Design a protein around this ligand. Structure first.
Ligand SMILES: *[C@H]1O[C@H](COP(=O)(O)OCCCC)[C@@H](O)[C@@H]1F
Length: 251
């Protein structure tokens, strides 16, 4: 009648879903043919089964990271913050740019929740720790931090980030982008971080590249010895029109 934790529990059929996603990914992407999906799942399980779900570490996920090792085109990375759908829509069409969810490990875990229980092999399908209400070192949160760091470390040249220009803080220092990814871009390899600030409906005039939180991001990035650039996407529908058909003479 009562649940242990505040967050949603493990997604139903989690084991089968992860294995099936791995099979599909490794079928489509030829460079991942070497990957044994049962081994990936065993490694994924090993990270959190029989562990207290408030005591997960990045080391727990090391076997999975090793198996899910993947070369990503370093100059074609698209980061995003609080605007998942548009970023994915974009890379679904612009297939030569890659978000974290276009990597094997991001693909496996996208939109899923999982946790175990201490001193029993059971998956908890009733509840899982909420990052804020319960604890930060939980299976889902630790996974995303670990893979997000590794993804940001892979980037080179010009790295792009899609941001939501309709939000209160367009750049949020407390988001995963702001707290993990920005600080793990390697200054030796990354020339520029270019922000694309996506405008909300019909507000097509404000230069959001002058927003205070964008100036904050600019200052943080600049002080890491990386250049900052910013572009408004004033009218998102036209942007979508043009990505989908770039030969369109209106683009
Ligand atoms: C790494 O993190 C980005 C998404 O995180 P957001 O910045 O969306 O943070 C989510 C949690 C907010 C409290 C994306 O580039 C990649 F997945």
């Amino acid at each position: 009648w009562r649940q242990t934790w505040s967050g949603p529990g493990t997604t139903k059929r989690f084991p089968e879903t992860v294995l099936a996603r791995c099979v599909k990914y490794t079928e489509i992407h030829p460079e991942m043919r070497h990957v044994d999906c049962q081994s990936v799942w065993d490694a994924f399980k090993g990270a959190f089964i029989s562990k207290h779900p408030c005591d997960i570490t990045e080391e727990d996920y090391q076997p999975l990271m090793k198996l899910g090792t993947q070369t990503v085109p370093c100059n074609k990375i698209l980061l995003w913050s609080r605007i998942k759908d548009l970023a994915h829509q974009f890379t679904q069409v612009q297939r030569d740019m890659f978000t974290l969810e276009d990597t094997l490990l991001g693909y496996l875990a996208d939109d899923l929740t999982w946790c175990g229980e201490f001193d029993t092999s059971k998956i908890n399908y009733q509840s899982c720790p909420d990052w804020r209400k319960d604890c930060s070192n939980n299976p889902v949160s630790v996974f995303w931090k670990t893979v997000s760091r590794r993804f940001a470390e892979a980037a080179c040249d010009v790295v792009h980030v899609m941001l939501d220009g309709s939000r209160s803080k367009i750049f949020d220092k407390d988001s995963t982008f702001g707290s993990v990814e920005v600080h793990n871009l390697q200054p030796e390899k990354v020339q520029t971080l270019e922000a694309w600030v996506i405008h909300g409906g019909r507000e097509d005039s404000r230069d959001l590249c002058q927003d205070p939180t964008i100036k904050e991001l600019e200052s943080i990035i600049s002080k890491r010895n990386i250049q900052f650039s910013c572009k408004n996407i004033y009218r998102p529908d036209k942007f979508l029109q043009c990505v989908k058909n770039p030969e369109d003479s209106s683009c």
